[PDB]
Design a protein around this ligand. Structure first.
Ligand SMILES: Cc1ncc(COP(=O)(O)O)c(CN)c1O
Ligand SMILES: Nc1ccccc1C(=O)C[C@@H](N)C(=O)O
Lengths: 401, 401
């Protein structure tokens, strides 16, 4: 026989399928609204000029390639916590926190999930919004935790079901884990507003729930990193000792460099010391130590004041392009004579948008218009450009009118 | 009152607790023989010139930083199986394998572990040699396998306990997994000879054991890649469908770039496709996709005939400097007047040496002489220079006379 005769073929990657179907289409009008990364106004990858500058200035220094500590680059870790929390947060000043470098946002989630499995004796349940990032489920599941849900997306408004979400969260059994997207919910782009978050924080604190924030889009979501991190900060100001996942894939465009971090906010520095040793003991048999290159870039940008300013402006410019496209999409839908409400499109935030389109309409969009997207109605806004937005509005109008 | 009050401080690393009494040691001829990376004759980190040239050719190409496929850089994966097996290997001509890019050797070990856990229905037992790389145990425990052991190091001879190894391997329940260091065993330096391997390969095939190679040192071990890969190639040629972990940390000096690869040899190409689908399902919730920088560098070296040829001669310089410190230590111990047989310092292969020094004597070298090594009597040969080898012979002779 063979060792692996009984190993089945896994399911096809559905996004990969869309992107590949997109590549084969010879329609000069085609659009890839399944792309999982930022694109410029001509549909190209974008390497941030501040990143190119940072890299050049690293190359000039003739650095070694030695192993990083298990927790990664110490100055990346510190700059990264400062970015998330704000430079004068009481948490930094007291040092009641540990931040370790991870293999991007996914890496941070996987290391968090392993830490919960092993140390969060209070629960095995992690509550995910409905819906959540697809990979959140297998992450927590392979880490050895259980998944639950809470109402989030409202398919009747294509907005935030605040009343269902709040009701649900108030009946989560006490001391469960509640996963929260910091901003730019994936896949819907629907976010709670600041008053909604205050209410959610107040139930969390009341019911003694543990808040696990996923933050893949600070800055990138609105152009304002302080506004994007406001919820996380606010939960911390209210007495909630969150844990936090950060990713530099979108905000710095470091996708393939794999740069992210996991932070546990603790009672005090001594507790953070013990959490850190235990994070290290878990990190080491995953991958020993994290990659160097991307972390060098991020630290150089975050700790150099000229490079940081330049970086903040470039982030603001990506965020601005996405906001532009949503607006111009809604505008064009009106010119077309659409009579549907499309404000969810300007109401949502980040590069992912739940359109409210039905699966049959999506199929018309692929077949008749060569507009490629997933069956759940999710478009990646990064595939919209000023050149093709008029066409998108037309196509969508045709399939919905 | 806190989520983490019961999280205990982990034990202090030995390899980091002594490495830091070392600076405080003020004596002028002091050596750190506990470093786990190659150092040159002046004790410095060494970036290979071919790596430097590959970096510069890459810079000029102005490449993007987009995500890799879950399995990493296709061209790195293919060049890497070719490095391991020989470009005219049977296995590669027929396509009966899958190679995925991983987070160095450690990530290949964890990915493979997690594959065994989910798909190796035959058993939960993994046989490690006594002793093995420390991280092998938590890697497999955390992944959800059970650890067993087989006799390997012969403390009487500081060499290979062939008969013991073989009796142990002969009594391994059929369809258990057997882990093997491909060459340069870590931590001891003690490898089987080609005729010894032929007999391990016989037991493995007859008793239907699964063979898991860990190959961290190809070319860096002996100076000769084909010779270092020989036992892996032999097993396959013997009808053994191995899996294989590679690392470019030491041979390319790509430590902190985290470059490695995990290979499963299968009965045919359709099995490889099934297996590959399943490695992808395991990798995605670990870290989604692998780091770009290192693999780009490795791939560039391996797919350019000129560069590849240069890199192999740099690998040979490192292997050779290590062989040279090995032979110089033995002669200098003679020169000093030692009576003991020290041919083991010289039969042993790669950057790690089990010296045979008892724990008391280890203490004496640290206090009396300022020679820092771990208590098991292991030294890093990379920390021996032509500069300090004289003094080391003197110090070792004293404590052993
Ligand atoms: C909510 C969320 N969390 C985590 C990630 C992972 O990002 P990465 O591993 O590329 O850093 C993403 C993007 N897929 C995300 O949208
Ligand atoms: N390819 C990735 C690589 C790294 C991290 C995430 C991804 C994703 O696919 C997730 C997100 N972009 C999603 O909408 O599909």
């Amino acid at each position: 026989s063979s060792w692996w005769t009984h190993v089945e073929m896994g399911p096809p990657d559905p996004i990969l399928g869309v992107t590949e179907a997109f590549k084969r289409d010879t329609n000069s009008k085609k659009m890839n609204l399944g792309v999982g990364a930022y694109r410029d106004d001509n549909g190209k990858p974008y390497v941030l000029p501040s990143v190119r500058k940072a890299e050049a200035q690293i190359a000039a220094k003739n650095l070694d390639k030695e192993y990083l500590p298990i927790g990664g680059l110490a100055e990346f870790c510190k700059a990264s916590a400062e970015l998330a929390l704000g430079e004068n947060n009481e948490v930094l000043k007291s040092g009641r926190f540990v931040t370790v470098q991870t293999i991007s946002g996914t890496g941070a989630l996987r290391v968090g999930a392993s830490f919960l499995q092993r140390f969060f004796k209070f629960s095995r349940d992690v509550f995910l919004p409905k819906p959540s990032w697809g990979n959140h489920t297998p992450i927590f599941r392979d880490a050895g935790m259980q998944l639950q849900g809470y109402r989030y997306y409202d398919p009747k408004t294509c907005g935030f079901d605040f009343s269902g979400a709040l009701e649900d969260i108030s009946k989560i059994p006490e001391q469960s884990v509640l996963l929260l997207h910091a901003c730019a919910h994936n896949p819907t782009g629907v976010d709670p507003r600041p008053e909604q978050w205050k209410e959610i924080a107040s139930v969390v604190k009341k019911k003694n729930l543990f808040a696990f924030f996923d933050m893949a889009y600070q800055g990138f979501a609105s152009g304002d990193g302080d506004k994007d991190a406001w919820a996380v900060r606010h939960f911390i100001e209210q007495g909630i000792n969150v844990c936090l996942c950060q990713s530099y894939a979108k905000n710095m465009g470091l996708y393939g460099e794999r740069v992210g971090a996991f932070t546990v906010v603790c009672k005090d520095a001594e507790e953070a010391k013990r959490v850190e040793s235990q994070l290290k003991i878990l990190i080491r048999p995953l991958y020993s130590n994290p990659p160097l290159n991307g972390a060098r870039i991020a630290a150089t940008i975050l700790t150099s004041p000229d490079l940081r300013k330049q970086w903040l402006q470039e982030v603001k410019g990506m965020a601005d392009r996405i906001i532009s496209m949503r607006t111009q999409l809604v505008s064009n839908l009106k010119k077309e004579g659409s009579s549907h409400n499309w404000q969810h499109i300007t109401d949502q935030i980040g590069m992912f948008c739940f359109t409210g389109l039905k699966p049959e309409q999506v199929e018309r969009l692929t077949k008749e218009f060569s507009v490629y997207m997933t069956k759940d109605g999710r478009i990646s806004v990064a595939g919209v450009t000023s050149g093709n937005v008029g066409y998108l509005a037309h196509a969508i109008h045709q399939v919905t009118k």
